[PDB]
């Protein structure tokens, strides 16, 4: 029973964010700033209802969803694309498919210990992020 992802989470590692951004066609000036940043993620979860805020000194990104309910997602201030997003549970892993112009786009997020893991995929690029829970 580890579906409860509530909390404030501070990034401790960010593997291949460069490759994931390049797969999304982010220009190199934007990548040069974005690759260096520590992100914070705030998850406010009530059952299958999620309100999430991911923040940094450069850009912030909010996304709210209900697990199992497809929604329109506009990745404002990121790659600025429109996708149809669906989040589901696979066991206790939160899985998102972002259907749109990029193949194999989505993410998976899950808890282990006091760490949150987030793997973001676009095409043949996977970015692996780890966050530690803030007290
Ligand atoms: C929002 C902080 C980082 C922003 C970096 C700025 C520009 C880079 C442009 C594009 C890269 C694409 C995505 C950023 C990667 C992660 C932020 C969270 C994305 C997301 O949907 O996470 C889900 C799962 O945690 C939010 O519910």
UniProtKB/Swiss-Prot annotation:
Top-level taxon of the source organism: Eukaryota
Annotated binding of all-trans-retinol, by residue: 41, 109
The keyword Cytoplasm belongs to this UniProt entry's keyword annotation: yes
Keyword presence, Transport: yes
Localization per Swiss-Prot or TrEMBL: Cytoplasm
A molecular function GO annotation: retinal binding
InterPro entries the UniProt entry points to: Calycin, Fatty_acid-bd, ILBP, Lipocln_cytosolic_FA-bd_dom
Main location: cytoplasm
Gene3D superfamilies: 2.40.128.20
Keywords of the record: Cytoplasm, Retinol-binding, Transport, Vitamin A
A Pfam family assignment: Lipocalin
Tissue: Higher expression in adult small intestine and to a much lesser extent in fetal kidney.
GO BP annotations listed: epidermis development; fatty acid transport; vitamin A metabolic process
One GO CC term on file: nucleus
Protein function: Intracellular transport of retinol.
Family recorded in the similarity comment: Belongs to the calycin superfamily. Fatty-acid binding protein (FABP) family.
Written domain comment of the UniProt record: Forms a beta-barrel structure that accommodates hydrophobic ligands in its interior.
Protein name, entry field: Retinol-binding protein 2
Taxonomic lineage from the root: Eukaryota, Metazoa, Chordata, Craniata, Vertebrata
